[PDB]
Amino acid sequence: FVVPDITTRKNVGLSHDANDFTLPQPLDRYSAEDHATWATLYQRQCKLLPGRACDEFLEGLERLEVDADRVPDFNKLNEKLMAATGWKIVAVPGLIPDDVFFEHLANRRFPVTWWLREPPDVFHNLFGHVPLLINPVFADYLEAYGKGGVKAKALGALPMLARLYWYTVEFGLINTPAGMRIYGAGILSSKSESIYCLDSASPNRVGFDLMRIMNTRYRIDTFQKTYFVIDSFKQLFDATAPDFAPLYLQLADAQPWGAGDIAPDDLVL
Ligand SMILES: [Co+2]
Numbered sequence: 001f002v003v004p005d006i007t008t009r010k011n012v013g014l015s016h017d018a019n020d021f022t023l024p025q026p027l028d029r030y031s032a033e034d035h036a037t038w039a040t041l042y043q044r045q046c047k048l049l050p051g052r053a054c055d056e057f058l059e060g061l062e063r064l065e066v067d068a069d070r071v072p073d074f075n076k077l078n079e080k081l082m083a084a085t086g087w088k089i090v091a092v093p094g095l096i097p098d099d100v101f102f103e104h105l106a107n108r109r110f111p112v113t114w115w116l117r118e119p120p121d122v123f124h125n126l127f128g129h130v131p132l133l134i135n136p137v138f139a140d141y142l143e144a145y146g147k148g149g150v151k152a153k154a155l156g157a158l159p160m161l162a163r164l165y166w167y168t169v170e171f172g173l174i175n176t177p178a179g180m181r182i183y184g185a186g187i188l189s190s191k192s193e194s195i196y197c198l199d200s201a202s203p204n205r206v207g208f209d210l211m212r213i214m215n216t217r218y219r220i221d222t223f224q225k226t227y228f229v230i231d232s233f234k235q236l237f238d239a240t241a242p243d244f245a246p247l248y249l250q251l252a253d254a255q256p257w258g259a260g261d262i263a264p265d266d267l268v269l
Contacts, residue, residue: 037116102150209267
């Protein structure tokens with residue numbers, strides 16, 4: 001049997017723009033159970049993340065006044081985000097087409113799935129992804145990433161950018177004098193990957209390298225086998241400076257690294 005998935009079920013009776021896929025945040029659809037689920041997830045992550053999340057992340061939660069006890073009102077959050085870096089969040093139904101996603105980031109809009117899991121949802125997207133948007137260097141990286149979507153689409157290279165996004169914005173680590181810390185949203189919203197990625201001898205921790213990353217496969221249904229480590233958000237922004245077109249064409253011919261591979265030139269940590 002095939003039953004409707006959570007995206008389908010949650011969006012019953014709702015609409016979205018056929019071109020940009022946004023909708024007003026449907027506040028009336030959040031039940032008491034939704035707010036309680038949010039509060040439980042927020043409490044869980046805030047207990048586990050000190051000394052694991054990068055300090056900027058935890059500061060962003062506070063500066064944006066991300067609600068601890070209910071699903072946040074996007075408009076209220078936007079008042080703080082806009083004043084900090086000129087970014088805003090927009091509600092979307094769930095996963096959206098790549099060219100739409102890139103167009104949003106290129107215009108300093110961060111798409112956030114509106115609905116919550118039952119006890120890539122609103123907790124993952126808002127709690128995991130949004131706090132670092134108050135950091136001007138990280139925000140500029142996302143904008144530059146977005147702006148690259150047009151060229152990538154024209155060259156059939158969106159999956160090569162998707163690898164960069166996955167291994168930075170979703171699953172990135174940042175080294176600090178106090179020890180390795182986490183900035184990837186997929187880790188920051190996770191119950192246990194937050195532990196494994198810092199504490200386990202199992203995964204590879206490899207120094208950030210743009211070409212290497214864009215040549216690296218990833219898998220979505222398991223903890224990462226490789227994490228890429230930056231020294232600064234400036235390293236991410238600076239990585240977007242050159243022309244990606246000849247990088248894409250070089251990679252198009254190559255065999256990608258597997259998700260668990262170590263490459264000959266890796267700086268291994
Ligand atoms: Co994500």
